[PDB]
C-alpha cells in the first residue's frame, strides 16, 4: 500500500 520508506518519512 503505502510502502515502508514512505511511512519512514
Amino acid at each position: 500500500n503505502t510502502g515502508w520508506l514512505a511511512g519512514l518519512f
Partner: antibody
Amino acid sequence: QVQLRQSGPELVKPGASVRISCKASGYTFTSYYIHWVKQRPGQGLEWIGWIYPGNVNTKYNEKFKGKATLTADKSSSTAYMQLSSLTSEDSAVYFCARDDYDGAWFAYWGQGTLVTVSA
Amino acid sequence: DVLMTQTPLSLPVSLGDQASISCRSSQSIVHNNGNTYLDWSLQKPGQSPKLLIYKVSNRFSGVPDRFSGSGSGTDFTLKISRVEAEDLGVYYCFQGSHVPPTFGGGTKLEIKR
C-alpha cells in the same frame, strides 16, 4: 530468484530525451519500491528517485526533479526512467535497485545501463 | 544534507589479512523511528553494487561470515576477518535514515606488494 533486467546501452544526442527500462522477475512487483541510481565515472553513487507501483507513488531527488521522470507498467512488471534535456554530464551508468522490506533501501541491483551523451 | 565520508580512501592489503574500513556521518543517523538504517555494499569493476551488511550489523542473504558491521551514531566500521581476493573492489557505506539518502565516497580494497 530475484531478477532485474535493464534496457541496454544508449548513445544519444544532447538535448534529446532517453528512456531506460527495468524488468522485474521473481517477486511481487507491486509489493516493493524501485529506485534509480546514477553512477558517473568520477562521482560515486547518487540516488535519483523511487517509484512504488502499488500506488504509483514517486519521490525524486531535488537534483533530478524535472530531469528524471519515472513510470511503471504493472502488466509487464517493467519500470522506466525518462530523462529529458541531456547534458554531457548525464553520461553515466544508471542502475535500478529494489529494497528489502524493513531492511535496506537497495537489496537487489539491476545490471545497469550505460548512457553516453555526445553530439 | 547528510554527508558520509569513508576514512581510508584506498586500503592496500595482503590476501588473508585483517581489514577495517571506517564511515563517519555529518550528523546522527539514528532515525526518529529508532532504527539506524546504514548499509555496506561491495562494487566490483564492471558490476552493480552488492549489499553486504544492512542496518549496521545485519548480514544480507548469502554473505559469508567474514564480513561484519559495528558502531552507532556517527562512527561505523566494516570488518573483514580474512580477505579473500573475491573481496576486492570498492566498498561503499550508505545512509538511509534522512530525506535524501547518501553514499560514502567509497574505500578501495587493493593488493599490497
